[PDB]
Paper text:
In the context of DNase bacteriocins, the HNH motif, which coordinates a single divalent metal ion within its centre, binds to the minor groove of genomic DNA causing random cleavages that overwhelm the DNA repair machinery of the cell and result in death within minutes of intoxication. In this work, we have solved the first structures of the DNase domains of pyocins S2 and AP41 in complex with their cognate Im proteins, in addition to the structure of the isolated pyocin AP41 DNase domain.
Pyocin AP41 DNase domain protein crystals diffracted X-rays to 1.5 Å resolution and were found to belong to the P41212 space group. AP41 DNase domain adopts the typical mixed α/β HNH fold seen in other DNase bacteriocins. This fold is essentially identical to that of the colicin E9 and E2 DNases with RMSD values of 0.83 Å and 0.63 Å, respectively, for Cα atoms. In the AP41 DNase structure, the Ni2 + ion displays octahedral coordination geometry, which is coordinated by His738, His763 and His767; by a single water molecule from solution; and by the hydroxyl and a carbonyl oxygen from a citrate anion within the crystallisation solution. The two conserved water molecules that are seen in the pyocin AP41 DNase–Im complex are also observed in the apo AP41 DNase structure.
Residue numbers in the entry: 643 to 775
Amino acid sequence: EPGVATGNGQPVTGNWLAGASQGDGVPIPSQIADQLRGKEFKSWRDFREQFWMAVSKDPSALENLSPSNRYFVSQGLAPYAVPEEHLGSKEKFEIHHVVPLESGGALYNIDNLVIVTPKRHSEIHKELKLKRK
Ligand code: NI
């Protein structure tokens, strides 16, 4: 579903992915949002690839990735999370829609995105489901 990205992200210092395994996940750094906002995307896959390429071009965001993960984001691929944070065949950091798409959330609004591990993304959706009761 094609669209235009919007949103600004957050000012982030330090290790921007450390919190991806916990809580609400981590916001998108504003300097990554700046490389995407206003651009048109053909599909979610297109956005995801350009998102990780934007990460690859930012020294601050690259600094807390392993060397192998720096290679992968330079190819527009998501970096791998540690094994304890995998969920079935899902092994890489995921972009989660904070208000889910299925709950009226925006697809390419960067302020509706966080990064989460596969394990934490699944937990967040379980928790959202429970809280409907
Ligand atoms: Ni999600």
